[PDB]
Amino acid sequence: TESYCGPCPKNWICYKNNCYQFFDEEKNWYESQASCMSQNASLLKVYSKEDQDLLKLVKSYHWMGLVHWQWEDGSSLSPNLLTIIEMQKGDCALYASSFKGYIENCSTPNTYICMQRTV
Amino acid sequence: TESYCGPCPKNWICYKNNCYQFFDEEKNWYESQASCMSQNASLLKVYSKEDQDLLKLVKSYHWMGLVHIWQWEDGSSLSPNLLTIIEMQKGDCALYASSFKGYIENCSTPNTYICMQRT
Ligand SMILES: CN1C(=O)[C@H](Cc2ccccc2)N(C)C(=O)[C@@H]2[C@H]1CCN2Cc1cc(Cl)cc(Cl)c1
Structure with a gap:
């Protein structure tokens, strides 16, 4: 039921x-x-x-850590997580709902989401 | 434990x-x-x-619990210096909009909404 976060x-x-x-x-x-x-x-x-x-409810487009595909930490993209759609030619990706990555020019200004996890 | 929510x-x-x-x-x-x-x-x-x-980050407009009979659902009144109340429509229910705005709108109009719980 309940929990702490x-x-x-x-x-x-x-x-x-x-x-x-x-x-x-x-x-x-x-x-x-x-x-x-x-x-x-x-x-x-x-x-x-x-x-x-809750990423299904994201409004608009935001930078995520996916670069050309793997994450910042060097971990690879797991296969069944994101549908990758070309928006602009580029080497970076925007997150948008629902579980889409939109290829974007890395120089293009965009809002962004930061994340931490202490396992 | 201060780090848990x-x-x-x-x-x-x-x-x-x-x-x-x-x-x-x-x-x-x-x-x-x-x-x-x-x-x-x-x-x-x-x-x-x-x-x-965090409510400065909210995108789009969403029902909140303020209703003019201005009272919250728990019966408390709106406190000063919290929301800019705006009345573009005649109405008796309030939508939240960033940043700390409340738009008075017709209660019958369908809108997205935000729920809240506090133990
Ligand atoms: C309408 N909306 C918003 O306004 C929020 C910003 C926000 C978030 C929470 C409380 C106030 C404001 N942003 C901007 C979004 O894109 C979406 C949705 C809600 C959910 N969020 C996306 C989201 C996804 C995960 Cl996995 C975890 C979190 Cl915490 C949030």
Whole structure:
């Protein structure tokens, strides 16, 4: 039924023990990556439809940590998680609902989602 | 333990010990209220710009629990210095909009809604 969520920094949003923050500033992919890292975090990593099911409600497009495909940490993209759609020619990806990755020019300013997990 | 948030239902968002859930199937205010109650919750109650500073990130408009008979569902009145109340329509129910706006609208109009729980 109920549970606690964490551990997370207190100004981060907690969902199924992952910590998220949304940034409304539009930045290119590298600036966004650096922004998350400066907060002991990374860009959004999509690893579970079940544990990240609220990603189905995302409004708009946001940078996630997927680059040309693998994640920031060097982990590969798991196969049955994202439908990858070409939007602009590019080497980075935007997350958008529902479980889509939209290929985007890495220089294009976009909002972004940061994520932390303490397993 | 300061790093944990809750208690909340396992599939709800937690922020500063409040639990939130977003519903994107549009309902009128009364049906939105009943939907939140069916999950042991209420519609969004806005009581603090700091404790609920995540509400600056909300995209689109959503039913909250403020109704003019201005009272929240729990019977408390709206506190000052929380929301900019705007009346573009005649209406008796309020939609939340970022940043800390409440739009007075017709209760019968279908809208998305935000539910909230706090133990
Ligand atoms: C309408 N909406 C919003 O306004 C939110 C920003 C927000 C989030 C929570 C509370 C206040 C504001 N953003 C901008 C979205 O894109 C969506 C939806 C809700 C859900 N979220 C996406 C989402 C996905 C996961 Cl896995 C975890 C979280 Cl915490 C959020």
